[PDB]
Design an enzyme around this catalytic site. Structure first.
Site, mmCIF file in Angstrom:
data_model
loop_
_atom_site.group_PDB
_atom_site.id
_atom_site.type_symbol
_atom_site.label_atom_id
_atom_site.label_comp_id
_atom_site.label_asym_id
_atom_site.label_seq_id
_atom_site.Cartn_x
_atom_site.Cartn_y
_atom_site.Cartn_z
ATOM 1 N N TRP H 126 0.805 -1.224 0.000
ATOM 2 C CA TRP H 126 0.000 0.000 0.000
ATOM 3 C C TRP H 126 0.840 1.278 0.000
ATOM 4 O O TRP H 126 0.297 2.371 -0.217
ATOM 5 C CB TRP H 126 -1.035 0.004 1.124
ATOM 6 C CG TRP H 126 -0.545 0.490 2.447
ATOM 7 C CD1 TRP H 126 0.196 -0.205 3.331
ATOM 8 C CD2 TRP H 126 -0.818 1.773 3.066
ATOM 9 N NE1 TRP H 126 0.406 0.549 4.471
ATOM 10 C CE2 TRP H 126 -0.206 1.767 4.333
ATOM 11 C CE3 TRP H 126 -1.519 2.915 2.670
ATOM 12 C CZ2 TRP H 126 -0.269 2.861 5.214
ATOM 13 C CZ3 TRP H 126 -1.573 4.009 3.549
ATOM 14 C CH2 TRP H 126 -0.953 3.970 4.803
ATOM 15 N N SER H 156 -11.737 14.427 -2.069
ATOM 16 C CA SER H 156 -12.941 14.235 -1.277
ATOM 17 C C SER H 156 -12.712 14.577 0.187
ATOM 18 O O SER H 156 -13.461 15.356 0.738
ATOM 19 C CB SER H 156 -13.424 12.795 -1.395
ATOM 20 O OG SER H 156 -13.907 12.319 -0.161
ATOM 21 N N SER H 157 -11.646 14.071 0.805
ATOM 22 C CA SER H 157 -11.356 14.350 2.239
ATOM 23 C C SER H 157 -10.894 15.753 2.575
ATOM 24 O O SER H 157 -11.251 16.289 3.618
ATOM 25 C CB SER H 157 -10.319 13.390 2.802
ATOM 26 O OG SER H 157 -10.640 12.053 2.491
ATOM 27 N N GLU H 242 -1.895 10.058 9.049
ATOM 28 C CA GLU H 242 -2.992 9.172 8.652
ATOM 29 C C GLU H 242 -3.300 8.086 9.683
ATOM 30 O O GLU H 242 -4.456 7.836 9.993
ATOM 31 C CB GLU H 242 -2.740 8.500 7.316
ATOM 32 C CG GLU H 242 -3.810 7.505 6.901
ATOM 33 C CD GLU H 242 -5.072 8.139 6.331
ATOM 34 O OE1 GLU H 242 -5.072 9.330 5.974
ATOM 35 O OE2 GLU H 242 -6.072 7.416 6.197
ATOM 36 N N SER H 255 -15.191 7.678 23.905
ATOM 37 C CA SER H 255 -15.410 8.598 25.053
ATOM 38 C C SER H 255 -16.915 8.734 25.293
ATOM 39 O O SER H 255 -17.381 8.619 26.407
ATOM 40 C CB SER H 255 -14.754 9.985 24.848
ATOM 41 O OG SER H 255 -13.316 9.975 24.863
ATOM 42 N N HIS H 290 10.099 6.886 11.663
ATOM 43 C CA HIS H 290 10.214 5.569 12.345
ATOM 44 C C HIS H 290 9.802 4.459 11.382
ATOM 45 O O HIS H 290 9.976 3.271 11.631
ATOM 46 C CB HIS H 290 9.457 5.474 13.722
ATOM 47 C CG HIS H 290 7.983 5.782 13.685
ATOM 48 N ND1 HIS H 290 7.311 6.446 14.687
ATOM 49 C CD2 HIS H 290 7.051 5.560 12.719
ATOM 50 C CE1 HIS H 290 6.028 6.620 14.275
ATOM 51 N NE2 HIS H 290 5.822 6.110 13.078
ATOM 52 N N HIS H 291 9.275 4.893 10.254
ATOM 53 C CA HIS H 291 8.833 4.032 9.207
ATOM 54 C C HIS H 291 9.985 3.785 8.247
ATOM 55 O O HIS H 291 9.800 3.164 7.185
ATOM 56 C CB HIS H 291 7.697 4.732 8.444
ATOM 57 C CG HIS H 291 6.388 4.696 9.158
ATOM 58 N ND1 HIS H 291 5.607 3.571 9.260
ATOM 59 C CD2 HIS H 291 5.802 5.622 9.957
ATOM 60 C CE1 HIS H 291 4.618 3.845 10.123
ATOM 61 N NE2 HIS H 291 4.721 5.069 10.576
ATOM 62 N N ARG H 438 7.038 -9.915 6.014
ATOM 63 C CA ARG H 438 5.701 -9.502 5.555
ATOM 64 C C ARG H 438 5.742 -9.640 4.018
ATOM 65 O O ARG H 438 6.819 -9.755 3.394
ATOM 66 C CB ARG H 438 5.439 -7.996 5.798
ATOM 67 C CG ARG H 438 5.779 -7.396 7.146
ATOM 68 C CD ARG H 438 5.643 -5.889 7.092
ATOM 69 N NE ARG H 438 4.412 -5.463 6.444
ATOM 70 C CZ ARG H 438 3.937 -4.214 6.451
ATOM 71 N NH1 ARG H 438 4.585 -3.228 7.082
ATOM 72 N NH2 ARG H 438 2.784 -3.962 5.838
#
Ligand code: HEA
Ligand code: HEA
Ligand SMILES: [Cu+2]
Ligand SMILES: [Cu+2]
Ligand SMILES: [Cu+2]
Ligand SMILES: [Mg+2]
Ligand code: NA
Ligand SMILES: [Zn+2]
EC number: 7.1.1.9
Lengths: 261, 84, 227, 56, 75, 47, 43, 514, 98, 84
Positions: H126, H156-157, H242, H255, H290-291, H438
């Protein structure tokens, strides 16, 4: 209930959001057809339905504001936030392109000759036309300001006069930039220098064309007496967007044209 | 350099129309003069087949697919060398 | 390599990998503490008929649950940062082997003196000899001298790959046009397996790494016999 | 110039039960039917192309 | 000589420059000593080092580029 | 605005017959879950 | 949350049916594709 | 009339409903893909025949769940439905535009489906990183289609992010300050800001990949002097905000759910809970790397990124403990959603703790790109974002519909999916510590047990999602109309009845300026 | 400089914009743009909640910095009181309906 | 890096008191921690009699006129070399 006692606008069902969504489907898939099956009919249809949608959607927005009186104070304050926010999202769009540029120039790969600008590249002179484009844009920033003040003082003629000067300076920058593109000794294909230069300056160029058609609209709405010395948001948005456009150019200029070359 | 022009670079449509015709436009005239004075057309740069330039990993979606959009034959060599 | 029904890390073949096992134990001890605490407090909350639904005063207890987690993070961050600088630490390698990822095979290059270089491919499970590991065996292992500080330089000649070998505690992506460095140093001879750790297309799953560590002497003869 | 914004104001405030995108006249409807037709046709054309493209 | 030693001027995981610097340094030294004779003495250290660190294909494509005169670096 | 109101009237599908709904919800979610499966069959049947 | 009793209650038998139809609509189409995977892989 | 209502809408409710429908459907697609992924791994060997099909399948799973299920549902569904209701607004600030934000989603999904149809599809992960994503390794219209599907989903977002900020800020009762709006609203205002800032950078990054694939640019090509790592920066700059954009709304729903079923008038430490979300949002913009701990960066910067990434646990910690404080002394109603809320509180905990382990760059060296990280993110996404979506859905279903769900069936569903997801993802921690990578369609023999158990687990969840469809059906089939709702004094969304009329608040609420 | 020509709101504002314009200058607020100011809220000095119907939702911020607003429908009739703080509210016919 | 903390970084004494104790002060605490964590006292640098340093064209108007104002004997060598 039945009759509303809030100062907000409840918009009538509009077929424009669908027609604009469908519009983007046609344009993107149409660009895929072009890029791969070398055909443009789909992209041409998409661009058409797109202009049709933007035309009528903004048309209605004028209908509801200017003719039907729906833009109360509560409503305009919300249109203000929307435009501010929209401009911010655009600042962050251009932010990826300056990132791309600095990542590339502050540390040139050996494939470039381990330096910047890369060997083989003959950058333009910042003191030549790039300076001209800078002064043209900055001037339009002061003339658009004179136009806004005229408006607030109800000087119909001078507002038209300042807006016109401003519009022609944007067209002047557009033509100058067009010729620079044609005369430039490098291209999008000339590695990361050409890549980084033509897409950053390219997108901004597209933004000047969008900012100028916006002011052209403001010009005509004025001829037609749409704005009052006090309620004239379409022009403020038009002016906010135009200032975003100079600032991006000063950052382009000092970075790519001056420093990075 | 710097800048400081007496006063009045703020508030009044008259003041802004004053700057427009008294600072803004005269500048564009100067820069336009400068640009038209050093309009010295550069000689087309020597062509050397460098590998990091004239990139082509996929043909352009137009023309012979080897010609860039604002291709100017006089200063833009194709991958193999100048147009003619 | 890994064995059936394994839970933790493969046994450490080098000193940083041992170092990581202990850090991970430290860190794991703490996550066990915290996650059992959050589970106890939850069942506590849900196990009484007593009620107090009126407004309660926050903040007072808010300092405890804010300063305490901060002390814990320092207790992990220190040990962690130590091992990290230790990994990127100044050592002096006595050998420099390069490896280059390719779409579906690694090729190694030992060019310190001679110009030794060979491809390395996974053995089709069809042609494995009894006892050989199904998706782990390579035809040409990468022979190296045990007990020695080697400097590996990972790159790729196409897409991205990632050179990995768990037992030694190494992983360095292979990026075209880049030379990433990493220090290898085993303290035990043997065969050590690893696999490509970056999606690179169809056979991302079929291009392993096998390290064969023998004493210098056998390394030299091998190297020469290798050309 | 003119300044017949009031003529327009009355026209668009007329209680003819129409939605603002039609409120303006007959051309509104033709424009509307044109846009909808190109979008729908286009969306159909694109679907045809995907099918054509989704086979070797 | 065993292998290229630590070089403080390229202390991080990324060594791409270390390869590159030594390949230039060498060929520039070589070119000098040629256009000077100087008892045709030679700058071997750089060739040993760049030989250790640079992947073969980099070194090949670079030499090729130098042959056809399209090597982007300055020697 | 002649928009109906109340339970079962504020949605885009009729809820008057529980069996016709059983069939609409079935084609709906069912078609979604099946799409991935048939996309794979499609890729497996190409060359 | 209080509520009126069901306007059109769904008796056990009716539920059993709906639980069955729902399940099959998920399991059959996928079962078919999966059951034939080898054929597809055979060309 | 159907058209005018459902295709030409300008109603926050009718739109929110339209989202939930799209979300539920896309949810069905992503579930199927998650099952093909495990079908392939449930037994040593190859099932799908070719590995490119597997990668195409793994990639689509991530996009469908992230961009077409989680986001539409939580923001477009619950966001449009509940936001105007909780602050007393007549509708969203830009009704017409809001409708476009929805209608961009179906075409966006068509493009993503089309991409797996043409050519060999896009088996890129992805993260769609070049060179694998380029025109050599992935020549053809597929990746390009994937790139356009995201352009549309992003417009859209960004568009709706503008709507929620303007709405939430400009349309509250005049006497009500922001420190008086409910936490769900705060949660979606902050989420909206993250979208406004991060999504444009992805749009720039994927535009650059598109020009590199079709316009002969070389932003990420070394040949032109480009850098495949620059793409990793742009993407991950959006990629971290994200992951938080996906959990914040869930933080808000939880909550509300925990407070409502403890019979409390408000959640514990309201302002601290506002501070916590704002902090998480801010720190979430300075931790992206960190990715990229195994990519070649300078140790010093690798050190900064693990430190920065850790301070995030503090604010997150005050929310986990605040929710606990909220149950304290509450009069607990063991309703289905309270079960979803309790699950989230613990499972999200485990999964975020597991992500503290990975914050450690030293240790990340050997955990990166293994199944330990697939475990980390499925606990928070599959047992956090999803559990919040279920708790919130069963809690607000009566308001949206006017009908009630069968509480006993609702609890069986919880009981089944709880077992399922845990059995699927728990073993995966092992598989990763022990080295299984993975993005593998097959694995060394040793990894057979855990992948065998794990896949079995995936079948239980499917059962739980089939039962759910049934649960919704029988709810609509029996027709148990709602009569009385509890605690409405403090819960304004329930004051206009179930379901609220098409136009709520035609006449504003009345709030005094004390 | 010098000259004129642009319409004023006073002379060009129509619709609801015009309605809130004038109403505003007469001091009244029929469209709820401003925040009602509290009265002592005693049984004999209830907060008069105007309404264009016979029930209106009331949000009461019992105490100044409260984060929770207590909501309830106020109906035509005897003054009702906030469930959490007493405080009386009495409905009243809404005036400026245009 | 960048920044974006949900909303409210403007207008309201409460909002500003919020940022003061919720962003501003916590920052100073972190930086203070960082500063106190790398409080590694450097070793006094080797002394070499470079001519462009320890400049002295006119004695200082205080003390032996050869000692700088915030003279720290441990890290500041006189022209001739370290204090002791
Ligand atoms: C929210 C995001 C999301 C969700 C919930 C899931 C859910 C699932 N995912 Fe995951 N997955 C990803 C996002 C997600 N995943 C991502 C980002 C990747 C990485 C891709 C890459 O590497 O490039 C990935 C990778 C991935 C892998 C690794 C493959 C590999 O790397 O080789 C596996 C394999 O086990 C897996 C399994 C599953 C499974 C079994 C489910 C199951 O839990 C599904 C269970 C069912 C649900 C939990 C959803 C049901 C909910 C609804 C349908 C809503 C219903 C609607 C209403 C109530 C209104 N996923
Ligand atoms: C729902 C979204 C979600 C959430 C919320 C998080 C939250 C976190 N994630 Fe996660 N993460 C993912 C989804 C998510 N992540 C995804 C999708 C990926 C994979 C992407 C890909 O590559 O495909 C990923 C990848 C990923 C990596 C890289 C792995 C690699 O490829 O090598 C890192 C590394 O730092 C990481 C860390 C964290 C941390 C610090 C948190 C923290 O936010 C968690 C904080 C929670 C707590 C810590 C618990 C509550 C606090 C307490 C009870 C107080 C006490 C605690 C302590 C004392 C520590 N994540
Ligand atoms: Cu690989
Ligand atoms: Cu791989
Ligand atoms: Cu992250
Ligand atoms: Mg990786
Ligand atoms: Na398998
Ligand atoms: Zn009260």
């Amino acid at each position: 209930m039945t009759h509303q006692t809030h100062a907000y606008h409840m918009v009538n069902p509009s077929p424009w959001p669908l027609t604009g969504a469908l519009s983007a489907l046609l344009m993107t898939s149409g660009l895929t057809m072009w890029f791969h099956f070398n055909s443009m009919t789909l992209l041409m249809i998409g661009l058409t339905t797109n202009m049709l949608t933007m035309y009528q959607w903004w048309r209605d927005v004028i209908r509801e504001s200017t003719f039907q009186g729906h833009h109360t104070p509560a409503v305009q304050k919300g249109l203000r936030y929307g435009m501010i926010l929209f401009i911010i999202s655009e600042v962050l769009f251009f932010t990826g392109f300056f990132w791309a540029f600095y990542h590339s120039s502050l540390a040139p790969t050996p494939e470039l000759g381990g330096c910047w600008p890369p060997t083989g590249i003959h950058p333009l002179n910042p003191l030549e036309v790039p300076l001209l484009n800078t002064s043209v844009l900055l001037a339009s920033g002061v003339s658009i300001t004179w136009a806004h003040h005229s408006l607030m003082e109800g000087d119909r003629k001078h507002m038209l006069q300042a807006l016109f000067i401003t519009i022609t300076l944007g067209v002047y920058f557009t033509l100058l930039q067009a010729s620079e593109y044609y005369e430039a000794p490098f291209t999008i294909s000339d590695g990361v220098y050409g890549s980084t230069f033509f897409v950053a300056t390219g997108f901004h160029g597209l933004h000047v064309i969008i900012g100028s058609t916006f002011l052209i609209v403001c010009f005509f709405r004025q001829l037609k007496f749409h704005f009052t010395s006090n309620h004239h948001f379409g022009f403020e948005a038009g002016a906010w967007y135009w200032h975003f456009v100079d600032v991006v150019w000063l950052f382009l200029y000092v970075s790519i044209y001056w420093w990075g070359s | 350099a710097s800048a400081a022009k007496g006063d009045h670079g703020g508030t009044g449509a008259r003041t802004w129309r004053f700057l427009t015709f008294g600072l803004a436009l005269p500048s564009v005239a100067l820069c336009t003069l400068n640009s038209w004075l050093h309009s010295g057309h550069r000689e087309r740069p020597a062509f050397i087949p460098y590998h990091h330039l004239r990139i082509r990993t996929k043909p352009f979606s137009w023309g012979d697919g080897n010609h860039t959009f604002f291709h100017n034959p006089r200063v833009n060599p194709l991958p193999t060398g100048y147009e003619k | 390599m890994a064995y059936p029904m394994q839970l933790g890390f493969q046994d450490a073949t080098s000193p940083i990998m041992e170092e990581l096992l202990h850090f991970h134990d430290h860190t794991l001890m703490i996550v066990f503490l915290i996650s059992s605490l959050v589970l106890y407090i939850i069942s506590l909350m849900l196990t009484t008929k007593l009620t107090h639904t009126s407004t309660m005063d926050a903040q007072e207890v808010e300092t405890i649950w804010t300063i305490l987690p901060a002390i814990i993070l320092i207790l992990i961050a220190l040990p962690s940062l130590r091992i990290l600088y230790m990994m990127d630490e100044i050592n002096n390698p006595s050998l420099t082997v390069k490896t280059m990822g390719h779409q579906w095979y690694w090729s190694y290059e030992y060019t310190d003196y001679e110009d030794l270089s060979f491809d390395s491919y996974m053995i089709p499970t069809s042609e494995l000899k009894p006892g050989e590991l199904r998706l782990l065996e390579v035809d040409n292992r990468v022979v190296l001298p045990m007990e020695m500080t080697i400097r590996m330089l990972v790159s790729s000649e196409d897409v991205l790959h990632s050179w990995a070998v768990p037992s030694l505690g190494l992983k360095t992506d292979a990026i075209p046009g880049r030379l990433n460095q990493t220090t290898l140093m085993s303290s035990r001879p043997g065969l050590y397996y690893g696999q490509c750790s970056e999606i690179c297309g169809s056979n991302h799953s079929f291009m392993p790494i096998v390290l064969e560590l023998v004493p210098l002497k056998y390394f030299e003869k091998w190297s020469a016999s290798m050309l | 110039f003119e300044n017949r914004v009031a003529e327009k104001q009355k026209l668009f405030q007329e209680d003819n039960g129409l939605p603002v995108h039609l409120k303006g006249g007959a051309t509104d409807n033709i424009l509307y039917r044109v846009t909808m037709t190109l979008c729908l046709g286009g969306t159909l054309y694109s679907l045809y192309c995907l099918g054509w493209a989704s086979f070797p | 000589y065993q292998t290229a030693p630590f070089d403080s001027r390229f202390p991080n995981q990324n060594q791409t420059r270390n390869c590159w610097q030594n390949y230039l340094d060498f060929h520039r030294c070589e070119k000098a000593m040629t256009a000077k004779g100087g008892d045709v003495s030679v700058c071997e250290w750089y060739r040993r080092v760049y030989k250790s660190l640079c992947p073969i294909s980099w070194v090949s494509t670079w030499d090729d580029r130098r042959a056809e005169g399209t090597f982007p670096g300055k020697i | 605005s002649h928009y109906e109101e109340g339970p079962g009237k504020n949605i885009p599908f009729s809820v008057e017959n529980k069996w016709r709904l059983l069939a609409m919800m079935t084609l709906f979610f069912g078609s979604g879950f099946a799409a991935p499966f048939f996309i794979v069959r499609h890729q497996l049947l190409k060359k | 949350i209080t509520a009126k009793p069901a306007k059109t209650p769904t008796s056990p038998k009716e539920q059993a049916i709906g639980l069955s139809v729902t399940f099959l609509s998920f399991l059959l189409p996928a079962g078919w594709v999966l059951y034939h995977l080898d054929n597809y892989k055979k060309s | 009339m159907f058209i005018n209502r459902w295709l030409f809408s300008t109603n926050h409710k009718d739109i929110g409903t339209l989202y939930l429908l799209f979300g539920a459907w896309a949810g069905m697609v992503g579930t199927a893909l998650s099952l093909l992924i495990r079908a392939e791994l449930g037994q040593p060997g190859t099932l799908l025949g070719d590995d490119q099909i597997y990668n195409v399948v793994v990639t689509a799973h991530a996009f469908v769940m992230i961009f077409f299920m989680v986001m539409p549902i939580m923001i477009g569904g619950f966001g449009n439905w509940l936001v105007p209701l909780m602050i007393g607004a007549p509708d969203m600030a830009f009704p017409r535009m809001n409708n476009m934000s929805f209608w961009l989603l179906p075409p966006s999904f068509l493009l993503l489906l089309a991409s797996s149809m043409v050519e060999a599809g896009a088996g890129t992960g992805w993260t769609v990183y070049p060179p694998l994503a380029g025109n050599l390794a992935h020549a053809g219209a597929s990746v390009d289609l994937t790139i356009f599907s995201l352009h549309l989903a992003g417009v859209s977002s960004i568009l709706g992010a503008i709507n929620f900020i303007t709405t939430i800020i400009n349309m509250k009762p005049p006497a009500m300050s922001q420190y008086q709006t409910p936490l769900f609203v705060w949660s979606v205002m902050i989420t909206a800001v993250l979208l406004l800032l991060s999504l444009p950078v992805l749009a720039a990054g994927i535009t650059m990949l598109l020009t590199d694939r079709n316009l002969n640019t070389t932003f990420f090509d070394p040949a032109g002097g480009g850098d495949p790592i620059l793409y990793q920066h742009l993407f991950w700059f959006f990629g971290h905000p994200e992951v938080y954009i996906l959990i914040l709304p869930g933080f808000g729903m939880i909550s509300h759910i925990v407070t409502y079923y403890s019979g409390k008038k408000e959640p514990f430490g309201y302002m601290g809970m506002v501070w916590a979300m704002m902090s998480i949002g801010f720190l979430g913009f300075i931790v992206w790397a960190h990715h990229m701990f195994t990519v070649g960066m300078d140790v010093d910067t690798r050190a900064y990124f693990t430190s920065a990434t850790m301070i995030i646990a503090i604010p997150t910690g005050v929310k986990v403990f605040s929710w606990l404080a909220t149950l304290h002394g509450g009069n607990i109603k063991w309703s289905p959603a309270m079960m979803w809320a309790l699950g989230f509180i613990f499972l999200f905990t485990v999964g975020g703790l597991t992500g503290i382990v990975l914050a450690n760059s030293s240790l990340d060296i050997v955990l990166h790109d293994t199944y330990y990280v697939v475990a980390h993110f499925h606990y928070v996404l599959s047992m956090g974002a999803v559990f919040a979506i279920m708790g919130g859905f069963v809690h607000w279903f009566p308001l949206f519909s006017g009908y009630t769900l069968n509480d006993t069936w609702a609890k069986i569903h919880f009981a089944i999916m709880f077992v399922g997801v845990n059995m699927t993802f728990f073993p995966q921690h092992f598989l990763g510590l022990s080295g299984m990578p993975r993005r593998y369609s097959d694995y060394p023999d040793a990894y057979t047990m855990w992948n065998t158990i794990s896949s079995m687990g995936s079948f239980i969840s499917l059962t739980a999602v089939m039962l759910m469809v049934f649960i919704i059906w029988e709810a609509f089939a029996s027709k148990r109309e709602v009569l009385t709702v509890d605690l409405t004094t403090t819960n304004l969304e329930w004051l206009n009845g179930c379901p609220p009329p098409y136009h709520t608040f035609e006449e504003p609420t009345y709030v005094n300026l004390k | 400089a010098s000259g004129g020509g642009v319409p004023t709101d006073e002379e060009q504002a129509t619709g609801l914009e015009r309605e809130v314009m004038l109403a505003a200058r007469k001091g009244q607020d029929p469209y709820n743009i401003l925040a009602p100011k509290a009265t002592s809220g005693t049984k004999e000095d209830p907060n008069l909640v105007p309404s264009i119907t016979n029930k209106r939702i009331v949000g009461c911020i019992c105490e100044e910095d409260n984060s929770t607003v207590i909501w309830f429908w106020l109906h035509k009739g005897e003054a009702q009181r906030c469930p959490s703080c007493g405080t009386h509210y009495k409905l009243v016919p809404h005036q400026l309906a245009h």
